[PDB]
Amino acid sequence: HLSDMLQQLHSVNASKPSERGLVRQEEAEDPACIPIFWVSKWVDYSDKYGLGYQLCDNSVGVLFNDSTRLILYNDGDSLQYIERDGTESYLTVSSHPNSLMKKITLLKYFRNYMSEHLLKAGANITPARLPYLRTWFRTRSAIILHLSNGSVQINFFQDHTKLILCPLMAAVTYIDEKRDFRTYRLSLLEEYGCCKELASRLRYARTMVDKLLS
Amino acid sequence: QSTXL
């Protein structure tokens, strides 16, 4: 889906949407395309262990340094372990192999840290296969998060704005600096235009999706 | 880390 996302972003950025004669950004809004899943908190502990994260349904996950993943569902008991080749296993906290005790303990450490310290992004949105974090990286400006359902999320450090790109819907959700959450069809952004701030962030997103492709 | 509460 990354190449589809790249093509969608190219088409919208090529149209120079902030130069529309009259920009009508609101006409591009499509609340039906609001994503089900996004990353609502995260902690990069990759100097030792890896990247812990919360999804907006309050499930939590870790992408460990060895490229395995452990997901704890929002019931607090169901687990999914994903090996580095994508092989999935389904377990529980109450019945799991002893070989996973260290990673379960680490996941619990991340879950508790994020609960005690970090603000939930998108908490104002009222509530599908649960995705896992496929890969991530940071730049000077942002963290880029690639989920296994094809979504790409980009969180900008300076001003707290966020994009959630969904190539299946050809849509982008933008959370602005006031924490207002709006979802747009990319083709309608091409038609109706958008403000310079969003246009600028969609240009940066194309660059970031390009880096993911490699 | 993401942002603080």
Cβ–Cβ pairs < 8 A, chains A and B: 22
Whether residues B5 and A43 touch (CB distance < 8 A) is answered with no
Alpha helix (H) residue ranges in A74-164: 101-117
Domain housing A115 = 41-130
> Are A43 and B3 in contact (CB < 8 Å)?
no
CA distance from start to end of chain A: 14
Q: Are residues A147 and A187 in the same domain?
A: yes
Q: Are residues A139 and A188 in the same domain?
A: yes
Asked if A174 and A199 sit in the same domain, the reply is: yes
* 3-state class percentages of chain B: helix first, strand second, coil last, to nearest 5: 0, 20, 80
Stretch 16-55 of chain A: residues touching chain B, C-beta under 8 Å: 41-44
Contact A39, A31 (CB under 8 A): no
**Residue type for position A163:** L
CB A163 within 8 A of CB A173: yes
CA of A16 vs chain B CAs: smallest distance (Å): 31
Among residues A130, A146, A163, the one where a domain terminates is A130
Kindly provide the residue ranges of all beta strands, DSSP E only, lying in A11-107, ordered along the sequence.
39-45, 50-55, 60-64, 69-72, 78-82, 88-92
Which residues are registered as beta bridge partners of A133? A147
| A210 plus A158 within the same structural domain | yes
Which of A42, A119, A155 has its CB closest to that of B4? A119
* Of the residues A80, A104, A130, the one at which a domain ends: A130
- Rounded CA-CA distance A69/A210 in Å is 24
Q: Can you tell me the distance from the alpha carbon of A33 to that of A29, in angstroms, rounded to the nearest whole number?
A: 9
Check whether residue A165 and residue A191 sit in a common domain.
yes
Neighbouring residues of A207: CB distance < 8 A, sequence distance ≥ 6? none
- DSSP strands (E only) in chain A: 39-45, 50-55, 60-64, 69-72, 78-82, 88-92, 133-138, 142-147, 152-156, 162-166, 171-175, 181-185
Looking at the structure of chain A, the number of domains it has is: 2
DSSP-derived pairing of the beta strands A152-156 and A142-147: antiparallel
**Which residues of chain B lie closer than 8 angstroms to A121, CB-CB?**
2
| Beta bridge mates, A60 | A54, A72
Same domain, A99 and A23: no
